[PDB]
Write a protein that binds this DNA or RNA. Sequence first.
RNA 1: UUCAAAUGAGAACUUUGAAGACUGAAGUGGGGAAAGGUUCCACGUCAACAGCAGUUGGACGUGGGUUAGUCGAUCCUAAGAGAUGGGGAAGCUCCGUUUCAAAGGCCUGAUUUUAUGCAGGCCACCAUCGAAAGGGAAUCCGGUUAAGAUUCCGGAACCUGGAUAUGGAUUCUUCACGGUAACGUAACUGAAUGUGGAGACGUCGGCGCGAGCCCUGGGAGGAGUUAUCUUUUCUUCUUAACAGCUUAUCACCCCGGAAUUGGUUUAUCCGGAGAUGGGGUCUUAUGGCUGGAAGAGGCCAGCACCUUUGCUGGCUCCGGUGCGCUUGUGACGGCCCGUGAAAAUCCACAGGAAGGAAUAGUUUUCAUGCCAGGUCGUACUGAUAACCGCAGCAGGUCUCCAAGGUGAACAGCCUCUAGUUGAUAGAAUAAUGUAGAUAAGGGAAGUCGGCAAAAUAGAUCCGUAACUUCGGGAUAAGGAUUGGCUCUAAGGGUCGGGUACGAUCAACUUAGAACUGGUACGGACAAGGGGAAUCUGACUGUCUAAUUAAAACAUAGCAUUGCGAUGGUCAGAAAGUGAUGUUGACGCAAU
RNA 2: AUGGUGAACUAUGCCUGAAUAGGGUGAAGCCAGAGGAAACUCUGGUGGAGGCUCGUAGCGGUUCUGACGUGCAAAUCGAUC
Lengths: 77, 91, 63, 252, 50, 112
Amino acid sequence: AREITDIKQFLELTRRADVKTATVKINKKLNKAGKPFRQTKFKVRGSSSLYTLVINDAGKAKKLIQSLPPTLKVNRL
Amino acid sequence: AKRTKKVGITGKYGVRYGSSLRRQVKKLEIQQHARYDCSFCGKKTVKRGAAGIWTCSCCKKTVAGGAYTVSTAAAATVRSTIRRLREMVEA
Amino acid sequence: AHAQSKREGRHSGYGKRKGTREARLPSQVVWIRRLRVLRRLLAKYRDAGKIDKHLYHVLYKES
Amino acid sequence: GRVIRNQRKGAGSIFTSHTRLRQGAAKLRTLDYAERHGYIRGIVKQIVHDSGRGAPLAKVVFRDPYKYRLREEIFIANEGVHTGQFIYAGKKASLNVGNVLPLGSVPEGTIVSNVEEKPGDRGALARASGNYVIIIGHNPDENKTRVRLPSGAKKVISSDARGVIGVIAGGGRVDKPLLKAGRAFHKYRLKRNSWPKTRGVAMNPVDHPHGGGNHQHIGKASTISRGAVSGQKAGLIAARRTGLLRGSQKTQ
Amino acid sequence: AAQKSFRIKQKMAKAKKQNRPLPQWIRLRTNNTIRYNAKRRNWRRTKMNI
Amino acid sequence: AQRVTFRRRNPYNTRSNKIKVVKTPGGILRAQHVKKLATRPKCGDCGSALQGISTLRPRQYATVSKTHKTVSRAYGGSRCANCVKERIIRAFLIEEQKIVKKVVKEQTEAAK
RNA sequence: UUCAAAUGAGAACUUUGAAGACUGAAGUGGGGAAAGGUUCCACGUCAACAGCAGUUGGACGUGGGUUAGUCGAUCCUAAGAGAUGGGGAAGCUCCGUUUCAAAGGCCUGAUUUUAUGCAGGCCACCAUCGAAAGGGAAUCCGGUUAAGAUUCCGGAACCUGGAUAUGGAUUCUUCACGGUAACGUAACUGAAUGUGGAGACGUCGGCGCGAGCCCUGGGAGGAGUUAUCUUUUCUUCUUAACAGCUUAUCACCCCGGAAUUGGUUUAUCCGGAGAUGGGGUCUUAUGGCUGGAAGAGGCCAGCACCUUUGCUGGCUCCGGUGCGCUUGUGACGGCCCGUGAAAAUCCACAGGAAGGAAUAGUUUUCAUGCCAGGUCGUACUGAUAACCGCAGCAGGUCUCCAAGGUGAACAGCCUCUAGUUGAUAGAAUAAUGUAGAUAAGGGAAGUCGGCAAAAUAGAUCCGUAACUUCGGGAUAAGGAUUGGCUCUAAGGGUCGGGUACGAUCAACUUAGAACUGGUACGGACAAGGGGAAUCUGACUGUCUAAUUAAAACAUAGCAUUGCGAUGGUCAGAAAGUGAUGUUGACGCAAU
RNA sequence: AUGGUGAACUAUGCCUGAAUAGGGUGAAGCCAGAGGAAACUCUGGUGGAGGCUCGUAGCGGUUCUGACGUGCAAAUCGAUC
Ligand SMILES: [Mg+2]
Ligand SMILES: [Mg+2]
Ligand SMILES: [Mg+2]
Ligand SMILES: [Mg+2]
Ligand SMILES: [Mg+2]
Ligand SMILES: [Mg+2]
Ligand SMILES: [Mg+2]
Ligand SMILES: [Mg+2]
Ligand SMILES: [Mg+2]
Ligand SMILES: [Mg+2]
Ligand SMILES: [Mg+2]
Ligand SMILES: [Mg+2]
Ligand SMILES: [Mg+2]
Ligand SMILES: [Mg+2]
Ligand SMILES: [Mg+2]
Ligand SMILES: [Mg+2]
Ligand SMILES: [Mg+2]
Ligand SMILES: [Mg+2]
Ligand SMILES: [Mg+2]
Ligand SMILES: [Mg+2]
Ligand SMILES: [Mg+2]
Ligand SMILES: [Mg+2]
Ligand SMILES: [Mg+2]
Ligand SMILES: [Mg+2]
Ligand SMILES: [Mg+2]
Ligand SMILES: [Mg+2]
Ligand SMILES: [Mg+2]
Ligand SMILES: [Mg+2]
Ligand SMILES: [Mg+2]
Ligand SMILES: [Mg+2]
Ligand SMILES: [Mg+2]
Ligand SMILES: [Mg+2]
Ligand SMILES: [Mg+2]
Ligand SMILES: [Mg+2]
Ligand SMILES: [Mg+2]
Ligand SMILES: [Mg+2]
Ligand SMILES: [Mg+2]
Ligand SMILES: [Mg+2]
Ligand SMILES: [Mg+2]
Ligand SMILES: [Mg+2]
Ligand SMILES: [Mg+2]
Ligand SMILES: [Mg+2]
Ligand SMILES: [Mg+2]
Ligand SMILES: [Mg+2]
Ligand SMILES: [Mg+2]
Ligand SMILES: [Mg+2]
Ligand SMILES: [Mg+2]
Ligand SMILES: [Mg+2]
Ligand SMILES: [Mg+2]
Ligand SMILES: [Mg+2]
Ligand SMILES: [Mg+2]
Ligand SMILES: [Mg+2]
Ligand SMILES: [Mg+2]
Ligand SMILES: [Mg+2]
Ligand SMILES: [Mg+2]
Ligand SMILES: [Mg+2]
Ligand SMILES: [Mg+2]
Ligand SMILES: [Mg+2]
Ligand SMILES: [Mg+2]
Ligand SMILES: [Mg+2]
Ligand SMILES: [Mg+2]
Ligand SMILES: [Mg+2]
Ligand SMILES: [Mg+2]
Ligand SMILES: [Mg+2]
Ligand SMILES: [Mg+2]
Ligand SMILES: [Mg+2]
Ligand SMILES: [Mg+2]
Ligand SMILES: [Mg+2]
Ligand SMILES: [Mg+2]
Ligand SMILES: [Mg+2]
Ligand SMILES: [Mg+2]
Ligand SMILES: [Mg+2]
Ligand SMILES: [Mg+2]
Ligand SMILES: [Mg+2]
Ligand SMILES: [Mg+2]
Ligand SMILES: [Mg+2]
Ligand SMILES: [Mg+2]
Ligand SMILES: [Mg+2]
Ligand SMILES: [Mg+2]
Ligand SMILES: [Mg+2]
Ligand SMILES: [Mg+2]
Ligand SMILES: [Mg+2]
Ligand SMILES: [Mg+2]
Ligand SMILES: [Mg+2]
Ligand SMILES: [Mg+2]
Ligand SMILES: [Mg+2]
Ligand SMILES: [Mg+2]
Ligand SMILES: [Mg+2]
Ligand SMILES: [Mg+2]
Ligand SMILES: [Mg+2]
Ligand SMILES: [Mg+2]
Ligand SMILES: [Mg+2]
Ligand SMILES: [Mg+2]
Ligand SMILES: [Mg+2]
Ligand SMILES: [Mg+2]
Ligand SMILES: [Mg+2]
Ligand SMILES: [Mg+2]
Ligand SMILES: [Mg+2]
Ligand SMILES: [Mg+2]
Ligand SMILES: [Mg+2]
Ligand SMILES: [Mg+2]
Ligand SMILES: [Zn+2]
């Protein structure tokens, strides 16, 4: 239901006591008028609602994924 | 452009009921739908809303009045009578 | 094809008309259209200075 | 034959008053300590139409002498009373339209409304639209007051019996032709089930003293005795005269 | 009646069960005299009256 | 052309059976049932819808934080500000004028 | 209605394919309320039943099938019903419902023998039943079954009760700051008592806006047609509840101080009780973008193979229009001797009893977290066969959704989607019929009587008498015109212009002019006969279900009668009984 | 005669719900204009009134004294209304 846009707040989520499962989706999408680019949505499933963070930059994307808690059971795609 | 030689508001009844009744109705209709002066605030904005009830659009006072007109002759004389009678009681 | 030919004015003579002129397009609809157009031409003239508010105000009630 | 219409009325089945929309009964304040030694003030808070009634009601609210709360009352609005007006009630109240005072405290000529028949009965006399009673005399020993009711009747009641200064609102309601069947329809639709009215002379004998015959006609004097019996009393009951009234009426 | 009381459904169910032919093995009992179910009901020949 | 059906057993068009037509992600038309519209809370003194205050159906107010139910003035969510100017002004002058009446008739009780 | 195939002992009637039609979104479509009760669905299957038949069935036999914290019931109150202290009645029982009654239960404090006795102060509200259309806490989409689904599965929410910790906020000025103000907010203590709001409310009219539908351009796809013609015809291109931000007519605040009166609606209402102007505040209906959410669904292409049935790709985009249609909603306006429910329930405010920090307190109306949500209904029909009429009866029976053309139109007539193509059949076409049409000349001579039938009709223009309550009579009467095609003319929107015009996009309406045809053109459909008088009821309305619709009844209007409550009229066997009466002569009752 | 059972039809009241194509007419209110010495009188608009009117659905049941009259039917069917 919810959407998140503070990269810092997101890492805080991903470590909350109930947050067990999470997922990364990949969307091909077009940029401005010209070409396309690679969007990636980070979805943490907290107990009562599903938070989702859209990182629009393929760069920030990769590095963020490394920071992902090594016990979180991420679903890739 | 004058639309009617004499029925006025009463034209809505067509030919029915008889000219006399339509006359009587005409008089009290004109009375009840009329816009009246508000004693309290001075704008002519008192319109009726069910027999006896007279309310002011602006300012919002409501005054009990006549079935079809804000003040009734009987009411009015009674008012001054009471004026008069009360006058004796302090004097 | 037919709609086209109506856009072109065909099929609209007296022999092709069955509702009253008024049922086809209301007098009142026409009026409101018209009166809105005069009304908002005044407003723009006023708001430009092309007209002075005094002349406007007479024109309004004349309109 | 059959039980006639005016007898069936009394068992009030389909004949009870249509009541659902009514504001509540109209009533003076219960005659407490304030109103019979001093006065107590209220505000008319709303004047309001009451279905089936012709005169508007005044909703008037007072403080409670013995408990912290408002107590609200339903008055019948006298002409000229208005929202936000202060209404004064009690022995020692002052003589203006809208206030309620015991007939003992008002000079003869006073024009009042909703007056009590006995003190405390919270109002009975002259409540219909336009109506009032005039005080036409006092008898300070054995404190009675003598008034003239709207009917013409003069009557003497206790001087503690209360009434409200002025006339009831909605006057002249009856000056205006109903015009059509339909307006009577809605009139009685909010009152009781008395409309329309079949003439007994249009029924068959089973149904009415007037019923039957090969022409329509009453066949006997329609002035019926007081001592007649149920089933018999139709027409001019106890009529002491009859025929078009010539010449001025008005109680001499 | 498309949205029913338990009471009515209960009766309905007791009626469903009673709607079957005679259990043939009965026919073979000593002194048995019942040929056929003489109390069989059908929704389009006889109504339950509830 | 796609038509639609009620979704509760009630077939009648009552105030509690309002319907709104909607396109689903399946790409079909479907009815949705619609709760009655909330009305705005009104002022105790005048009667106007009072500004500042959320409008919900009554039980829906116990689901919503305290600040959807007030403005931060005296008689906040209850009376309509202008109605409270009036209250303050009227209070003051009357309490003042009460001081006035006392000292006036105090003089009447000493000079007569 | 027809051809063929398949199945079967058997085929006009079953199944499948083809063809010809129909219902024509006011449905022969898609669902429901009452009622039925298994009729639903599968398999088997024809003795009876389906007024021919039967391999088929709502039949017969045997089985399967109805899943809920959120949909209903349950709760609330309505007309009304109805216990109880009582009062009548021989009594079955009648009356009364807050009444002539000693009518009861909550909040916490008092206990640290202990479990709950008394200590305050309240509150005197005095049953209960009565709505599956009224009121009302909370759920949506996709998928799935032979037959259930807002109920299962997937995913995403929300409400109510109960538990509670962590963060945040608050406090040394203890119970927040900010804004002149309308008021802002992530929070920001609040008992008794009081008060306010919501729940909560007629009808019609135009206007404004939303939604879905309808019309339509570009593009990316699939289909159809192609002797000829058509950059063509048909079709797919979708986005739920919920959540973040945003968004409004109305209303309101600050500045200001108005005659040359201004502002202003289609509809004439507003201003020194402060307009117009400028600048702000608020409701969040509704819409926007994003989250949900492309992973779904929709449409294609390319390989795989008895199989479960897969696998892999793509594309699912950008716009236009309006007195359109339906529905919703707002700001207004008309109307009344009519002014158009109640209760449960939820919130707010006034109040300030009380409780509470600095060596550390207060806070669950802020966030996040944990647990639980019982009981009954849920299948299907809803009607020219599942209900009621003895029946599979041309009858009756409450309701929501509603496409294109023509046209004023939810009319008639043709059509798309969906659904039907069921109603014994074959061969002939005598009389007499029923139902549908036409007739030369005459034109009511027929007949009790123009009964029946015929005639008239749409729209635009022209023209319209007696009489009249001046509103009508009136479409009075009487006339002309009306197709096709091809042109001209008039009626609009949006923009930048120092402090006269230009440029652009999008709509049928109306009028006039040519041309043209076997003089036809409201070309089918649709659609008033008119006039002069007499009798009679004023009118609209009403009745003899099933031989009388009328001049009968009603009505408004007129007039008469009774009555001031210790009453008039009327109910009851009686009564501490009842109707009018939530009443009061501008009223109730009776003619 | 005595004691019982019915307002599922229907009559009337009450409570709570629902429903009703498209046209014709053009009442009050309101704007602008014209005449007149004056009193006052006219014209064009706007507006959208009515137990108003044409006419579906609805509700009704007038005529054919039509059909049927061992019926589809113990009251129906058709046209007209
Ligand atoms: Mg007009
Ligand atoms: Mg318009
Ligand atoms: Mg314009
Ligand atoms: Mg003006
Ligand atoms: Mg009663
Ligand atoms: Mg009656
Ligand atoms: Mg009569
Ligand atoms: Mg009479
Ligand atoms: Mg008779
Ligand atoms: Mg007799
Ligand atoms: Mg006699
Ligand atoms: Mg007689
Ligand atoms: Mg007579
Ligand atoms: Mg049956
Ligand atoms: Mg039977
Ligand atoms: Mg359903
Ligand atoms: Mg708010
Ligand atoms: Mg607020
Ligand atoms: Mg405070
Ligand atoms: Mg056949
Ligand atoms: Mg066809
Ligand atoms: Mg067809
Ligand atoms: Mg049709
Ligand atoms: Mg059928
Ligand atoms: Mg069904
Ligand atoms: Mg059944
Ligand atoms: Mg079946
Ligand atoms: Mg057989
Ligand atoms: Mg059978
Ligand atoms: Mg047979
Ligand atoms: Mg056979
Ligand atoms: Mg079976
Ligand atoms: Mg079975
Ligand atoms: Mg619910
Ligand atoms: Mg329950
Ligand atoms: Mg009892
Ligand atoms: Mg109940
Ligand atoms: Mg309910
Ligand atoms: Mg309900
Ligand atoms: Mg589904
Ligand atoms: Mg299953
Ligand atoms: Mg199903
Ligand atoms: Mg689930
Ligand atoms: Mg989940
Ligand atoms: Mg909770
Ligand atoms: Mg703060
Ligand atoms: Mg309250
Ligand atoms: Mg209230
Ligand atoms: Mg209601
Ligand atoms: Mg919802
Ligand atoms: Mg502004
Ligand atoms: Mg400002
Ligand atoms: Mg509708
Ligand atoms: Mg009103
Ligand atoms: Mg509130
Ligand atoms: Mg204490
Ligand atoms: Mg909380
Ligand atoms: Mg179902
Ligand atoms: Mg069927
Ligand atoms: Mg039938
Ligand atoms: Mg069907
Ligand atoms: Mg047959
Ligand atoms: Mg034959
Ligand atoms: Mg001939
Ligand atoms: Mg001739
Ligand atoms: Mg002759
Ligand atoms: Mg002749
Ligand atoms: Mg002859
Ligand atoms: Mg004759
Ligand atoms: Mg003769
Ligand atoms: Mg004829
Ligand atoms: Mg001819
Ligand atoms: Mg004539
Ligand atoms: Mg021509
Ligand atoms: Mg042009
Ligand atoms: Mg142009
Ligand atoms: Mg004669
Ligand atoms: Mg008549
Ligand atoms: Mg009539
Ligand atoms: Mg008859
Ligand atoms: Mg008979
Ligand atoms: Mg008739
Ligand atoms: Mg008849
Ligand atoms: Mg007369
Ligand atoms: Mg007694
Ligand atoms: Mg009944
Ligand atoms: Mg409605
Ligand atoms: Mg209409
Ligand atoms: Mg017409
Ligand atoms: Mg009409
Ligand atoms: Mg002049
Ligand atoms: Mg009209
Ligand atoms: Mg009519
Ligand atoms: Mg008519
Ligand atoms: Mg027509
Ligand atoms: Mg008809
Ligand atoms: Mg009919
Ligand atoms: Mg009728
Ligand atoms: Mg008939
Ligand atoms: Mg006959
Ligand atoms: Mg025969
Ligand atoms: Zn005023």
